Amino acid sequence: FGRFTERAQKVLALAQEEALRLGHNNIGTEHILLGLVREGEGIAAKALQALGLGSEKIQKEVESLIGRGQEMSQTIHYTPRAKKVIELSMDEARKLGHSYVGTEHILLGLIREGEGVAARVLNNLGVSLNKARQQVLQLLGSNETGSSAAGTNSNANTPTLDSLARDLTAIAKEDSLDPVIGRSKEIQRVIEVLSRRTKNNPVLIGEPGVGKTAIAEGLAQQIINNEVPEILRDKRVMTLDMGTVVAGTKYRGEFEDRLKKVMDEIRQAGNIILFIDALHTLIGAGGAEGAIDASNILKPSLARGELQCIGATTLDEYRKYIEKDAALERRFQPIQVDQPSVDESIQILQGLRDRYEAHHRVSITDDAIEAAVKLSDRYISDRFLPDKAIDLIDEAGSKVRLRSFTTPPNLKELEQKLDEVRKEKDAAVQSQEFEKAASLRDTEQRLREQVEDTKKSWKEKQGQENSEVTVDDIAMVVSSWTAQTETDKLLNMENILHSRVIGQDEAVVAVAKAVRRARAGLKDPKRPIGSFIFLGPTGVGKTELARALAESIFGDEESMIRIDMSEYMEKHSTSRLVGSPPGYVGYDEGGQLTEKVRRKPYSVVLLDAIEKAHPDVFNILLQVLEDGRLTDSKGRTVDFRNTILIMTSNVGASELKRNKYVGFNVQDETQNHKDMKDKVMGELKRAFRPEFINRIDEIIVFHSLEKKHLTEIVSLMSDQLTKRLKEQDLSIELTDAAKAKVAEEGVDLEYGARPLRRAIQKHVEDRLSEELLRGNIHKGQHIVLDVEDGEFVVKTTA
Amino acid sequence: FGRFTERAQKVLALAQEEALRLGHNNIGTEHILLGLVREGEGIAAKALQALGLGSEKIQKEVESLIGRGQEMSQTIHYTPRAKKVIELSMDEARKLGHSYVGTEHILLGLIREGEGVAARVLNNLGVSLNKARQQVLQLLGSNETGSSAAGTNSNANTPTLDSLARDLTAIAKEDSLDPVIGRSKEIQRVIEVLSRRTKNNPVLIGEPGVGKTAIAEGLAQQIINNEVPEILRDKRVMTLDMGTVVAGTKYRGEFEDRLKKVMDEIRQAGNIILFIDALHTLIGAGGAEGAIDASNILKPSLARGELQCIGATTLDEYRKYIEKDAALERRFQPIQVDQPSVDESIQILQGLRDRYEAHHRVSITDDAIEAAVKLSDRYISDRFLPDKAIDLIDEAGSKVRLRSFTTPPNLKELEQKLDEVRKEKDAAVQSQEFEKAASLRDTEQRLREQVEDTKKSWKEKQGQENSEVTVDDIAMVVSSWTAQTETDKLLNMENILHSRVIGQDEAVVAVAKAVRRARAGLKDPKRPIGSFIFLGPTGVGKTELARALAESIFGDEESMIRIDMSEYMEKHSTSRLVGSPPGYVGYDEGGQLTEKVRRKPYSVVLLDAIEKAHPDVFNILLQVLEDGRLTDSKGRTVDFRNTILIMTSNVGASELKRNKYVGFNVQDETQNHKDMKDKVMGELKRAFRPEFINRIDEIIVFHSLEKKHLTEIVSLMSDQLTKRLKEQDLSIELTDAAKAKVAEEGVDLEYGARPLRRAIQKHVEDRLSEELLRGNIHKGQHIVLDVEDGEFVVKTTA
């Protein structure tokens, strides 16, 4: 039902006692009622005893019902009536100060459900339903136990400390104050700044937003025992809570007045610590609106150090307060608030991990924690390092906890069946159709037990799967977003990149391995997952791999940035004029490159044809390649952390486009291979500076046809064909038998490689469409245009 | 009289029984009254029997009104009295919770209609009208029908469930709400997210706009029966829904406070699931302004795992929450939600067909759905895949149902007469003018019946027509906007393109058929539905076809975007289209091309002069043709889906200007045809960079004239001639003989047939106008340019 204590449950179970003992085959509210009076000295029972009802008195009425009875007590469970009462009471005990459920609450809950079996039992045994709830109630209430109140055993403090406000020291006497998670060196660092009084205030600057407040609670604790100096010893800690300070008078003027009142009482000689949150706002410096200019009072008080205070200030705002002068900053002092970096991340995860067992399957395993962090860093995305983490851990740790209970095969189908019956049955009884309902009822109960037995027979599937939550689990979950499906993308990357790369087995494998290394959790996360320079030809080379990489790692062809370096041979912006240039490398930094990768920090950054472009532009790109950042535009830091940077180039192109053929011998395959496997890496060095090339994982080499890179261009256009009809309905393929025959038409010596789209168009597309309009193919079928007899044939494969 | 209960309708028809039985030829309320008291055990009847009125008592009065009576009962229908009583009863039923109006309500309806036939019957039989309505009320008029008394159980629920809101758990107990449509494996994938609590929130990302809420209703069901985790044994789903919260509160601060209360009740921790609909609005991040940043409360609540929630964010928004940090991603987690793609579309169509049943034309057919879907996808193509679809089926799904019943033999003329009568008759009857009315009345009812028989005579045309909404029906309707008669626009494309093109028989058939190929299905919808190069002379074929293509395929002449790629060169746009720092290649990527085509992604994109245009431009153009998309404008996707990219090319002209002369020789002309239709697609290739232009579907070559062509060009000029004067309200026509004499001026070896507009201007426009100005014809009569003796002749005919 929920969560209950004994006392409750006992009155309920006494109902079951009555199930067989009174023969109430399913036990109504009356048995629950009897239950209440029958635990004797339970608060419900006691109430009923006030009304004069003994276990007897209830039971006599109760016995006048079924009368001991159907002692088979078929379906020896509750009734729907009693199930309402139990559910009501439980919650009616939450309502009446009890997290779970107490005996009293069940009688009270009975009263609530005052039309049920209990209710009529009680209206037959005289006593009113509210007189009963009265009696239970007067054995609840008058709480104040486990609590009291205290100020400060000094309270020299009084005119201030009355007003205005909570004191961290006070609330920490019994310790009803949460840690909160650190930000641990910060708590130490607070005592550095706070046993100061011309740097009175530690001033916590960081993401708000992780829980700055954890650090603050730090101070309180350490002034007691014992990290603190003798300075911060012999002190009392008071928080300047903004709401009481503004008061019900609801003005800034009132806020200042109350804050002043604290400053006068500060006569404790700096032995009082006052906490001023958003101290910069109070200083009133920075912005076009200061947000009150308390700085005037605060400055001599802080400077004298009589006001010794605690600062919570915002990253930029804090600068814009110490700038104010001349002892304003003789308070605040900055301190790094922990927003977890990757190692720290792991530790945070772990700290609330075990508690993911409120929604079970996680915690466990260690490797998964590590994965959570690490796997996010290379695969998905710009997100914060512990947030990334914790999510994966829980994500997978649940994914599977359902797959337990989704493996009952799909014995959900059982549940489905039972419905059809009920219906049939019900409607049949309504006709009567007595026994014509009968068998349908019976058919139900067959089902009912069958259904339920196999949904919880896969509680064995819970003990089987439902904790393990590994790297693999975590990766699958990281992929959900985007080490199962983060390394399977990698491990089979080469296969995937080759199917949209035009040959160039060299290129595919080079990129494949470098990305597969980095993206599997083992390298290049700060910089691009692969920075690369690609020399090759085009359409039998480079671009097509840039596309294929975007597609495989990040999802979709068009998750690809694209900047032209030939414009960065700049002077296209003085008088030829090109998109919004402050002056062209300034365009790259100031807008184009940085904005685009900030937009997708999870994409193939494609810096096309770096080539003869200004080496200074390459220095700018070099910061991406090394650091994986640029800081530009408006002060944005653009995370190329989870990009794969691909720079194309070519000035070797011709050979890289010139075959690998048996053009005059088979040694023309194997030295043309070698020729291309040379031409990329030396035209690379000749194109631009080595410094550039040096922050590049691999030099991706693109070759050309044995027969074979050519026939892959045919298959790139033919694959654009195979892809394009499902959007309107229809599965199209040019069969490989035909992709070969279509490839036959792309040979001349003097012109090839390009005509292929068109010849696929004529011989496939055009041929299939002029046969589809006639009505030789139904919609949503698979259309293979094949060769079957050495000629085109449209065959279907659904 | 509406769709209402039988019991009502029965008292009404019983009036008709009294119509003939007492001879009250048209039935007043006494007969309705009689109906009421005579049905015995109807609530009205029973009431009247209380009041002391048996069928007898009423009928005695009724019989004393007429008795027997014209049993012929001339016009044996209702009259305004009885019809009012019915209208009234309905209102007397409205008040008693009956839209299905019953026996009581009519007796009640009588009461309403005091000093009427019922009413006076009752005031003669000593029964006061309100005592009668009383009597009915105190039987049926105290409705409590279908009582269950709502709710579930539970009481702890109070702070949450008070607020806000109809909980998912409630609606699935009796299954009182629609599923609606999933995304079923998604419901499983969501419950996975409810098996976790530090990635708590499944986050449904998709169009709003799908009926997403169906997946959410999913959860409820799977947590119940029965295979769901140990976690989700004790799970309850309680809803946080914004709409009720904002209503009657009208402040952001208060709204947030209510959301805080919702977060608080979650103390049932590890027993409760909270549904946050529009979780994205709450996150209040990723924009430049929030939508109320509740995220601050939700994120730590989720991290602690006390809150565990069901999230609906948005496509991009899931990123823009996971960015927020540092347990902001420990909230959201993505889930796949689809707006129906084309195959799904077919299923949507069919599913709601049966619900359009009150049209008897939607009904049917599989093929009709298929047409709707398939045709919509390629043609308009400006909406979404099932919506487009369902609209076509239904478009046709009346169009023909109207052709069923366009006019039953249009005796609306009959009615016109019957009117003339009404008047004639009326005014005669008004004077007396007795027999002078007689024949007029008689003429009236003569007419009247005559109307009605032929007004229902295309119910024989219903037994002929009354369903047909097949393929062709659908096609016609899509053509109405813009398989068979929309695909007749594709199949008969050549005919359509030639009629608004300057000859160019080569060009017309090539584009026509190539587009028709793609629009059948095969020839690339991912890519532009036609990529093309149009070579030849401009204005002498090219542009004019781009227009004509738009017209046949897309349904509008001027559904044509048009960008010049040569300005994107900056070669005639270093000084001509540019000034200040921003300029033209920036226009092409940055907005012009991408924005315009995103607006209409069903337009002829006409990319002017792409030979000598930027080599950078061609990389972009190639990307349009291949990928079918460009991603520019900082992340906008421009759908070159059912665009027809038409790239023009200056070169070719000379051969195209050579013609298939009637005489010159015979050898070279019919080989000049063959020469221009071949050589031109190769003058393209020699002029510039192949990779873009070959990765196009077809290379279209445009004549100028083909000698052969002239008399077709003149008839385009003549149609341009004849139309522009209609705007000013004059009808002119050139006879074909006269269009012929103009055609004489564009025969030609090498000069094409660009001169034909001008020569129509000189010999027609100018000539007719030089005859119109001189007062031979004056302002608003018909002007024929004829040839009669081989010479021009200006004729008048109006």
The token pair at A359 is 């929604």
Distance CA B362, CA B343 (A): 20
The token pair at A569 is 């041979």
- Among candidates A557, A761, A769 on the partner chain, residue whose Cβ is nearest the Cβ of B627: A557
Nearest CA to B722 out of B707, B705, B706, B742 is that of B742
Nearest CA to A277 out of A196, A126, A165, A373 is that of A165
Question: Could B154 and A404 be called an inter-chain contact, meaning their C-beta atoms sit closer than 8 Å?
Answer: no
A471 contacts A368 by C-beta, under 8 angstroms: yes
Nearest CA to B612 out of B563, B570, B655 is that of B570
Q: Bridge partners of B682?
A: none
A313 contacts A295 by C-beta, under 8 angstroms: no
B715 contacts B741 by C-beta, under 8 angstroms: no
The token pair at A103 is 């005996």
Distance CA B720, CA B733 (A): 11
Question: Could A359 and B231 be called an inter-chain contact, meaning their C-beta atoms sit closer than 8 Å?
Answer: yes
Q: Bridge partners of B787?
A: B792
Per CB-CB distance under 8 Å, the chain B contacts of A462 are 229-230
CB atoms within 10 A of CB B167: 19
B231 CB within 8 Å of a chain A CB? yes
CB atoms within 10 A of CB A792: 21
Cis before B326? omega within 30: yes
B732 contacts B782 by C-beta, under 8 angstroms: yes
Place of tokens 């000049």: B672
In angstroms, the Cα distances linking A167 to A150, A216, A235 are 11, 12, 12
Q: Where are the alpha helices (DSSP H) in A518-648?
A: 543-549, 585-587, 593-599, 615-626
In angstroms, the Cα distances linking B194 to A368, B199, B217, B260, B785 are 20, 9, 13, 21, 81
A206 contacts A337 by C-beta, under 8 angstroms: yes
Q: Is the sign of the CA dihedral B499, B501, B504, B508 positive or negative?
A: negative
Place of tokens 């002007």: B783
Q: Which residues contact B93 (CB under 8 A, 6 or more apart)?
A: B4, B8, B99, B101, B102, B104, B105, B108, B109
Distance CA B553, CA B602 (A): 9
SS3 for B339? Answer: coil
Distance CA A25, CA A19 (A): 6
CB atoms within 10 A of CB B290: 15
B161 contacts B230 by C-beta, under 8 angstroms: no
A359-392 in b/e form (b: 16+ CB < 10 A) is bbbbbbbeebbbbbbbbbbbbbbbbbbbbbbbbb
Distance CA A461, CA A450 (A): 17
Q: Which residues contact B337 (CB under 8 A, 6 or more apart)?
A: B183, B186, B204, B205, B206, B207, B210, B212, B215
SS3 for A234? Answer: coil
Question: Could A406 and B635 be called an inter-chain contact, meaning their C-beta atoms sit closer than 8 Å?
Answer: no
SS3 for A124? Answer: helix
User: HEC string of A432-498?
Assistant: CCCHHHHHHHHHHHHHHHHHHHHHCHHHHHHHHCCCCCCHHHHHHHHHHHCCHHHHHHHHCHHHHHH
Place of tokens 């309707």: B477
Distance CA A554, CA A533 (A): 19
Q: Which residues contact A354 (CB under 8 A, 6 or more apart)?
A: A363
Nearest CA to A647 out of A600, A586, A688, A599 is that of A688
A199 contacts A193 by C-beta, under 8 angstroms: yes
Beta strands, E only, A167-323 = 203-205, 236-240, 272-277, 308-312
- Among candidates A112, A381, A573 on the partner chain, residue whose Cβ is nearest the Cβ of B581: A573
A656 contacts A650 by C-beta, under 8 angstroms: yes
Strands ordered across the beta sheet of A792-796: A731-734, A782-787, A792-796
User: HEC string of B451-505?
Assistant: HHHHHCHHHHHHHHHCCCCCHHHHHHHHHHHCCHHHHHHHHCHHHHHHCCCCCCH
Cis before A180? omega within 30: yes
What backbone phi and psi angles, to 5 degrees, belong to A232? -80, -15
Distance CA B105, CA B115 (A): 18
CB atoms within 10 A of CB A446: 13
In angstroms, the Cα distances linking B281 to B260, B297, B318 are 15, 13, 11
Q: In degrees to the nearest 10, what's the CA dihedral of A705, A708, A712, A718?
A: 130
Distance CA A688, CA B743 (A): 63
B613 CB within 8 Å of a chain A CB? no
Per CB-CB distance under 8 Å, the chain B contacts of A456 are 226-227
How long, in residues, is chain A? Answer: 798
**Phi/psi-derived region of residue B286, left when phi > 0, alpha when psi is between -120 and 50, beta in every other case:** left
Q: Where are the alpha helices (DSSP H) in B289-384?
A: 295-304, 319-322, 342-351, 366-378
The token pair at B336 is 């796949």
The token pair at A11 is 């009155």
Distance CA A598, CA A585 (A): 17
SS3 for B309? Answer: strand
The token pair at A531 is 């920075």
- ∠ Cα A592 A597 A598 (to 5°): 100
| Structural Rg of chain A based on CA atoms | 38
Per CB-CB distance under 8 Å, the chain A contacts of B342 are 726-729
Strands ordered across the beta sheet of B732-734: B732-734, B783-787, B792-796
> What distance lies between CA A102 and its chain's CA centroid?
39
Q: CB pairs under 8 A, 24+ apart, for B755-762? A: B756/B502, B756/B710, B756/B713, B756/B714, B756/B717, B757/B717, B757/B720, B760/B714, B760/B717, B760/B718, B760/B721, B760/B734
The token pair at A710 is 């050519």
Nearest CA to A716 out of A682, A678, A754, A663 is that of A754
DSSP assignments along A736-797, one per residue:
HHHHHHHHTTS--SSS-SSTHHHHHIIIIIHHHHHHHTTTSS-TT-EEEEEESSSSEEEEE-
Distance CA A472, CA A368 (A): 8
In angstroms, the Cα distances linking B646 to A429, B139, B636 are 71, 78, 22
Nearest CA to B394 out of B422, B357, B432 is that of B357
Distance CA B32, CA B89 (A): 11
> What distance lies between CA A263 and its chain's CA centroid?
46
First vs last C-alpha separation in chain B: 55
In angstroms, the Cα distances linking A411 to A160, B191, B216 are 69, 17, 22
A48 contacts A135 by C-beta, under 8 angstroms: yes
Distance from CA of A621 to the nearest CA of B (A): 20
In angstroms, the Cα distances linking B408 to A652, B395, B411, B415, B469 are 80, 22, 8, 13, 20
The token pair at B618 is 């061609």
Distance CA A716, CA A544 (A): 9
Cis before A82? omega within 30: no
Side-chain-facing half-sphere of B406: CA atoms under 13 Å? 4
- ∠ Cα A256 A261 A264 (to 5°): 125
> What distance lies between CA A149 and its chain's CA centroid?
42
Place of tokens 């049917």: B364
Question: Could B581 and A582 be called an inter-chain contact, meaning their C-beta atoms sit closer than 8 Å?
Answer: yes
Question: Could A3 and B234 be called an inter-chain contact, meaning their C-beta atoms sit closer than 8 Å?
Answer: yes
In angstroms, the Cα distances linking A742 to A4, A710, A711, B587, B752 are 75, 11, 9, 38, 37
Distance CA A427, CA A420 (A): 11
Pairing of strands A636-637, B783-787: unpaired
Question: Could A382 and B323 be called an inter-chain contact, meaning their C-beta atoms sit closer than 8 Å?
Answer: yes
* Quoted resolution (Å): 9.4
DSSP assignments along B656-721, one per residue:
HSS---SSS-STTTTTTHHHHHHHGGGHHHHHS-HHHHHSSSEEEE--S--SSSHHHHHHHHHHHH
Distance CA A292, CA A276 (A): 13
Distance CA A302, CA A328 (A): 7
Distance CA A608, CA A560 (A): 11
- Among candidates B153, B198, B200 on the partner chain, residue whose Cβ is nearest the Cβ of A84: B153
Distance CA B708, CA B229 (A): 79
- Among candidates A355, A456, A577 on the partner chain, residue whose Cβ is nearest the Cβ of B582: A577
SS3 for B607? Answer: strand
A51-84 in b/e form (b: 16+ CB < 10 A) is bebebebbbebbbebbeebbeebeeeebbebbbb
Q: Bridge partners of A796?
A: A783
First vs last C-alpha separation in chain A: 51
Nearest CA to A556 out of A587, A602, A521, A594 is that of A602
A358 CB within 8 Å of a chain B CB? yes
CA nearest to A597 within chain B: B634
The token pair at B706 is 């083909």
What one-character DSSP code corresponds to residue A515?
Answer: H
What one-character DSSP code corresponds to residue A78?
Answer: B
CB atoms within 10 A of CB A789: 8
Distance CA A96, CA A102 (A): 10
CA nearest to B629 within chain A: A558
In angstroms, the Cα distances linking A251 to A242, A243, B121, B667 are 11, 11, 77, 101
Question: Could B192 and A394 be called an inter-chain contact, meaning their C-beta atoms sit closer than 8 Å?
Answer: no
